[PDB]
From a paper:
Coronaviruses gain access to host cells using the homotrimeric transmembrane [name] protruding from the viral surface. S comprises two functional subunits: S1 (encompassing the A, B, C and D domains) and S2. These subunits are responsible for binding to the host cell receptor and fusion of the viral and cellular membranes, respectively. The distal S1 subunit comprises the receptor-binding domain(s), and contributes to stabilization of the prefusion state of the membrane-anchored S2 subunit which contains the fusion machinery.
Author numbering:
A (entry chain B): 722 to 811, 813 to 827, 855 to 1065
B (entry chain A): 27 to 66, 80 to 122, 125 to 135, 138 to 142, 166 to 172, 186 to 245, 263 to 444, 447 to 454, ...
C (entry chain B): 32 to 66, 80
D (entry chain B): 278 to 326
The structure:
Amino acid sequence: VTTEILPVSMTKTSVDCTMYICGDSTECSNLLLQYGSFCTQLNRALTGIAVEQDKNTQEVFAQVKQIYKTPPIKDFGGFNFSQILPDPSKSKRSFIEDLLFNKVTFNGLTVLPPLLTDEMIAQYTSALLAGTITSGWTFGAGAALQIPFAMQMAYRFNGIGVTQNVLYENQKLIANQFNSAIGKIQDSLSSTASALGKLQDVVNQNAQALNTLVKQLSSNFGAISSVLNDILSRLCPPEAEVQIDRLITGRLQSLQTYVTQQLIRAAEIRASANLAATKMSECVLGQSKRVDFCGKGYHLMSFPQSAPHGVVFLHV
Amino acid sequence: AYTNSFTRGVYYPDKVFRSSVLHSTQDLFLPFFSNVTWFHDNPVLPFNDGVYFASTEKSNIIRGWIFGTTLDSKTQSLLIVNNNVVIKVCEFQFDPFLGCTFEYVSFKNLREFVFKNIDGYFKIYSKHTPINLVRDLPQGFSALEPLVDLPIGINITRFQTLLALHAAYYVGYLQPRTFLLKYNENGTITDAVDCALDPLSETKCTLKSFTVEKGIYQTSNFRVQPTESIVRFPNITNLCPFGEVFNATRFASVYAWNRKRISNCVADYSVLYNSASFSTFKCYGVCPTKLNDLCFTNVYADSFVIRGDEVRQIAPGQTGKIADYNYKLPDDFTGCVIAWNSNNLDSKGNYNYLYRPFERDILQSYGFQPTNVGYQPYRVVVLSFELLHAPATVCGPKKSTNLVKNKCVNFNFNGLTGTGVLTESNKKFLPFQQFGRDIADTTDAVRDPQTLEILDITPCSFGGVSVITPGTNTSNQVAVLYQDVNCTEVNVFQTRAGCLIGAEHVNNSYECDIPIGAGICASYQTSQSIIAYTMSLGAENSVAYSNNSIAIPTNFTISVTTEILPVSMTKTSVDCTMYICGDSTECSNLLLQYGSFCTQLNRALTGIAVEQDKNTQEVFAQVKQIYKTPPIKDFGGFNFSQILPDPSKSKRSFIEDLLFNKVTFNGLTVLPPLLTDEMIAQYTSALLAGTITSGWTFGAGAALQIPFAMQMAYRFNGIGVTQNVLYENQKLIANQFNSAIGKIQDSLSSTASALGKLQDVVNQNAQALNTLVKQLSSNFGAISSVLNDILSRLCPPEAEVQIDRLITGRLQSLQTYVTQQLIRAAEIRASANLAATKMSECVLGQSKRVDFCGKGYHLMSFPQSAPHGVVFLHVTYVPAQEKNFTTAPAICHDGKAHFPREGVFVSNGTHWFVTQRNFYEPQIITTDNTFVSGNCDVVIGIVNNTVYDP
Amino acid sequence: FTRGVYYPDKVFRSSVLHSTQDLFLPFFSNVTWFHD
Amino acid sequence: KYNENGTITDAVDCALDPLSETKCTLKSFTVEKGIYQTSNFRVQPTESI
Ligand SMILES: *[C@@H]1O[C@H](CO)[C@@H](O[C@@H]2O[C@H](CO)[C@@H](O)[C@H](O)[C@H]2NC(C)=O)[C@H](O)[C@H]1NC(C)=O
Ligand SMILES: *[C@@H]1O[C@H](CO)[C@@H](O[C@@H]2O[C@H](CO)[C@@H](O)[C@H](O)[C@H]2NC(C)=O)[C@H](O)[C@H]1NC(C)=O
Ligand SMILES: *[C@@H]1O[C@H](CO)[C@@H](O[C@@H]2O[C@H](CO)[C@@H](O)[C@H](O)[C@H]2NC(C)=O)[C@H](O)[C@H]1NC(C)=O
Ligand SMILES: *[C@@H]1O[C@H](CO)[C@@H](O[C@@H]2O[C@H](CO)[C@@H](O)[C@H](O)[C@H]2NC(C)=O)[C@H](O)[C@H]1NC(C)=O
Ligand SMILES: *[C@@H]1O[C@H](CO)[C@@H](O[C@@H]2O[C@H](CO)[C@@H](O)[C@H](O)[C@H]2NC(C)=O)[C@H](O)[C@H]1NC(C)=O
Ligand SMILES: *[C@@H]1O[C@H](CO)[C@@H](O)[C@H](O)[C@H]1NC(C)=O
Ligand SMILES: *[C@@H]1O[C@H](CO)[C@@H](O)[C@H](O)[C@H]1NC(C)=O
Ligand SMILES: *[C@@H]1O[C@H](CO)[C@@H](O)[C@H](O)[C@H]1NC(C)=O
Ligand SMILES: *[C@@H]1O[C@H](CO)[C@@H](O)[C@H](O)[C@H]1NC(C)=O
Ligand SMILES: *[C@@H]1O[C@H](CO)[C@@H](O)[C@H](O)[C@H]1NC(C)=O
Ligand SMILES: *[C@@H]1O[C@H](CO)[C@@H](O)[C@H](O)[C@H]1NC(C)=O
Ligand SMILES: *[C@@H]1O[C@H](CO)[C@@H](O)[C@H](O)[C@H]1NC(C)=O
Ligand SMILES: *[C@@H]1O[C@H](CO)[C@@H](O)[C@H](O)[C@H]1NC(C)=O
Ligand SMILES: *[C@@H]1O[C@H](CO)[C@@H](O)[C@H](O)[C@H]1NC(C)=O
Ligand SMILES: *[C@@H]1O[C@H](CO)[C@@H](O)[C@H](O)[C@H]1NC(C)=O
Ligand SMILES: *[C@@H]1O[C@H](CO)[C@@H](O)[C@H](O)[C@H]1NC(C)=O
Ligand SMILES: *[C@@H]1O[C@H](CO)[C@@H](O)[C@H](O)[C@H]1NC(C)=O
């Protein structure tokens, strides 16, 4: 059992260009208007990215038509899934998902919430997992048709060129190797923070971009002072306007730089989300024949787990 | 008495002809639906910042107005009479009724006027229209045209009307509001939106349209305003000894100048400013008018005598006999230099004055005589002002006020101003620290000027405002969301996304329509209103899992679904020279000073345009030859006439015609594609004809004919369904297919939104071009956006400056446009690559990739062309009906364990059969259906049966 | 050692790393020792 | 480095050594494992001509 981690989304930021450039200052606001629609363009660009983030989330997780649940009596032929299934005592996340969630962590700048909360994402992964365990590949193709788990595995074994009698003759061994492999996943995830570095890197990059954008407010850009109020309380309107224009140009340029980088980064996230969505359909809902697509070795099955700003796949 | 002004009080903002356009302007207009005072009676009324006047007439009762400040002949006053329009501005004596630097001589009637007084000009707009109404003002809209503009220079504060005594009138006031005005084809303003009237009007102005589509928009911001001003300075009553310097008995020599420190006092700088005894008063630090609103850490008075011609050297950035050897100021000097003539004071000659940053270099004398201007002595005092952040001791003559805590105020602490809430801090400032600073260099905290306490400054509450609405095609009702605020601070529904007001909160969940955030969506439902709810994630459905039960489908359907992908975008191109300097050599010569920026812009756009043809070819040109169907079409009952080309038409298919009916001078142009719609149709025709008559072989190599029914048998085996199923049910399968295609047509012909993915690309690119053109109207700090207006009015020295401002702004706009086009193109390229992949894997073959070629088990696909993209029709096999069978992993015969070669074992309650997984079709269990491996003591769940041996 | 550092200005700051250039004593430089 | 009470409690001399140079470049008194591009080697003139 191996773990594959992919980013799905990034923080939905939004910036108020007027408050950023001319916070509570009418005198410069009236000059900002002389630059036309630059603020309109900045707002539309950021809004488009924020909307895209919910689209990316849905493409990856909302691939199930119905919310499926496992039976009250769990008998899967010796296969223990209790560490990947939801824990009723908890946001009802699984034990492993709780581990994943513990590893990744006034200037006109705000942050908007996602449409789907962690609770809703967990319900989708729960349905996908419950569906896979009790109906195999059929819940993807159409109706969820119940099948004994051991027989589901026999199908999956034939798919890799191994006659089904091998599974049944060695069923006890196979179930034990599987159960041990899951325990190994927990030991790694609970102790190795770097395991989820791919998701943490996204968080860190976006945090740096926002901090940099704010720090730029302290720059003079040739002005006598970075503070508009200090200019206005000291210089008369003929001279003042000059000092203000220097600050407007520098601050407007800083916003444009920020937005451009967010659009480029968003493209990277979109590509990752598209890959994750592909894997959900080809690794979880079915069985893949594509080499090294769903992990190293001959693919049998996969199980999704949610993570902050992304998805984690356990490939068997 | 008052009435409703409705939409009256709008006038043409200027004298420029416009047509078919929405124009945004800010001016003094009467706010929509405000109340106006109703008169029936000639009182004196306030004029305020401008007056809207309206009246209804029947018998010429209302005949004039008086405008002034006292209206009693003691001041300048404007009298207007209409008996012939007569205007006079004499100081007239006026209960007046109608029974100079300027003079002019020339209910059934509604007379409307706008009176505003700006920079000495009394501007009058008016409109007269016929009416048939006694009770009140008629409702309706008409813009008022400018009629008179009087260059009077008279202050107006109050006004009075004049009636004829042998008609009601209304008075409102104008406000600096923003309006979006709509000009029709004939250049008449026919409608208008008051951007401050309500949240829907606010949305309309934001979107620059009088129509708003369904959805949620971010349109404005909530901002708390200050309620009072707080002014704080040290409670010091000492006055600064400036007289001791400026009225000093004697000044020092410049080689040995004096330096007096001014501190611990109140500095009235209006005395030195207003005094007429000075020859010059030049400030380099701050502006004199503001100087008295500041407080300094110290002021130093440098006192000395120099010769008249040397006075020009007492400044920052100077060199010279004094500036370099006797007295120098730093280039960043902050303060004021004051000097005056001493020819009648120090001159005698007077040889006590000698000559050789702030250095006292402790040599020749000058003989100053009363008969010597440039050779006369001058007394100079330099006042050096320190504005560094430190405890201040020299404050201007400004009275303090009491300080108010935990309120939003406009504050001033020793000259430091801002808006915010003042609270008690826990910051331990050092004895020499007066202020603190945040990361943005804003003030974090301040020590009070009178009390040794530290206050924190927190900006007043604010947040984004979003408007949630069904489209204006259905309803003008809106709900408003205040982002990240408490409902107790701003139907009221508190969500994690903000405070939602106007939407009813309901318990029922539904499919999400207009998303708000944090699990909450809104919609318009029944009578109708906006509601909010937690979104449903889908229906709940448990699975009847057990270790001995399998569900096997007994029937199936054929489903056809549509997948739409963008392939290309418009191949635009921009001429940077024409865009920036259209027909202007004078600025073109300056554009050259920026190097290769134009070359880079041209190459970037050209590269994208070329890519667009590449994308098209990768998707459609995947066929080696152009294939055609036979004149006799017999595909075993399968009707393809709606996807094949129609010979009577660009020979497009019926469905392609539907797809094509749903998607729609400034140096900007558009280039055509290499492959026209006719050529794309030929490629899709060949691909379709190839697939139908040769299946998967035309892709792999040669097109090898195969009967269609046999092609389908192959495709069925590929999904785990034995070919006999196809043949036995061939009539059913063909009928399900034919019906599915008809359904596709019914949807595409009626649902325009079906092709939204292609329309979105078109809309985004159109917006980018329109935005780029609109930027040409911006001044970017210039006196005018028009180069010709600059060149016809300003000389070359000055002009070049105005031009550079426009070049920078216009060049920046082009760079912004190109960057966005390159980013969007990358998205289109990725889509085209996906479409090309699907063509090869879904159309030329058969896919085994789940949900790649539609939901269900893929059988075949057919391409159709569309504007700027490709549409795929995916044909899939979907299980329809199912039954509960008892199962087992193996069967015991002679102790041997029998396993199926294909399929599963099923029990109908009395007998065991073996059947294929994807279709119930029970077979007798025989030695030709099963194989033996291992035995009954190994397999878990093995059951006893009898296996037949032929 | 690390002696010769002073507050560059008179502004209150907290919980921050602030970059400044001024005339400071270089770290671990040698200083003349007098006893004279 | 200013602490919670606004007192300078520590400092980095950006010209002392390559680690201090890295700390200043990264605006932190802690440096993570890896390779950083922090400055430039430049030969100075020795005389005027
Ligand atoms: C599935 O594996 C888990 C291991 O996480 C088993 O849970 C343990 O059960 C033992 C015996 O009751 C307890 O002493 C441990 O404390 C449990 N571990 C945890 C983390 O709670 C669980 O019983 C196994 N289930 C099946 C059906 O095999
Ligand atoms: C195949 O390999 C597995 C281990 O992966 C063998 O199973 C182990 O056998 C040892 C005894 O030698 C036991 O102590 C372990 O507990 C078993 N592991 C598990 C998971 O059961 C298995 O016997 C090998 N099979 C063959 C034919 O060699
Ligand atoms: C126009 O005249 C009015 C008086 O009719 C001026 O307003 C007065 O200003 C003084 C000085 O602040 C106040 O004490 C009075 O109470 C004001 N009177 C009224 C009725 O407001 C007004 O300032 C003049 N306009 C200009 C530009 O000077
Ligand atoms: C394939 O389907 C089309 C339906 O679009 C059939 O065309 C219809 O034929 C009937 C009988 O002649 C006419 O009354 C309808 O007006 C036709 N519809 C249209 C849109 O023209 C076509 O005959 C079918 N072909 C085969 C071989 O089944
Ligand atoms: C499988 O389902 C199909 C429908 O999808 C059944 O075919 C229909 O049968 C009804 C009679 O009950 C007819 O009125 C319809 O016109 C038929 N539809 C078509 C397209 O022919 C079919 O009989 C079912 N097969 C089984 C074994 O139940
Ligand atoms: C209006 O008054 C003027 C005063 O000069 C007079 O000449 C004119 O005839 C009058 N017109 C009417 C209609 O009363
Ligand atoms: C413009 O005026 C013409 C009359 O010359 C009229 O027929 C047309 O309808 C008017 N257009 C609009 C938009 O009012
Ligand atoms: C200097 O004396 C004159 C009277 O001659 C007075 O008007 C002026 O205000 C005095 N200057 C100062 C700074 O007090
Ligand atoms: C303000 O006035 C009080 C007396 O009420 C005095 O004790 C205090 O020192 C004064 N503050 C300053 C800065 O002079
Ligand atoms: C918009 O209004 C028109 C009536 O002019 C109606 O025909 C159309 O169906 C409406 N659009 C929608 C999406 O309801
Ligand atoms: C609003 O304030 C109350 C306290 O009166 C608090 O319980 C509630 O959580 C707050 N809601 C939000 C969105 O801040
Ligand atoms: C939902 O139902 C509960 C009663 O079970 C009630 O208390 C609550 O107010 C209802 N909420 C809404 C939005 O109707
Ligand atoms: C199988 O049995 C379960 C339990 O009685 C029932 O809910 C389910 O609908 C049955 N399925 C079929 C196909 O008969
Ligand atoms: C099982 O199938 C056989 C063969 O058609 C039939 O005779 C028998 O009655 C069926 N059993 C049940 C319970 O329907
Ligand atoms: C199937 O489950 C039942 C109920 O727990 C049990 O009695 C039976 O032995 C199980 N059979 C197999 C093969 O696991
Ligand atoms: C199958 O039959 C054998 C006798 O030959 C018996 O020992 C065994 O228990 C039976 N198995 C089942 C599941 O009934
Ligand atoms: C700040 O001062 C308080 C004493 O008022 C002390 O307890 C705290 O530890 C100090 N904080 C730091 C970072 O030195």
